[PDB]
Symmetry: C3
Subunit: 32 residues, 3 copies
């Protein structure tokens, strides 16, 4: 139901955040 | 009420993630 | 219950976003 849907939304946000952390790591690698 | 608030908070996180994706993509290309 | 759990997940995501925003701000100073 809707609670499960909200949990799926949270899971999707976590994956988005992880992806951005990878991008930041790459930018730091390029910098130093 | 708390459920409505949680959904608003999720919407706000999606907007922040979008802004971050943009800033990262811009930085990777040296586009300001 | 489930709503309290979701609120805790959202709180964690908000901290993660804050950290990313800081890192991106710092990288912009580094690169530009």
């Amino acid at each position: 139901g809707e609670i499960a849907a909200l949990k799926q939304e949270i899971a999707a946000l976590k994956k988005e955040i992880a992806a951005l952390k990878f991008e930041i790591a790459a930018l730091k690698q390029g910098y130093y």
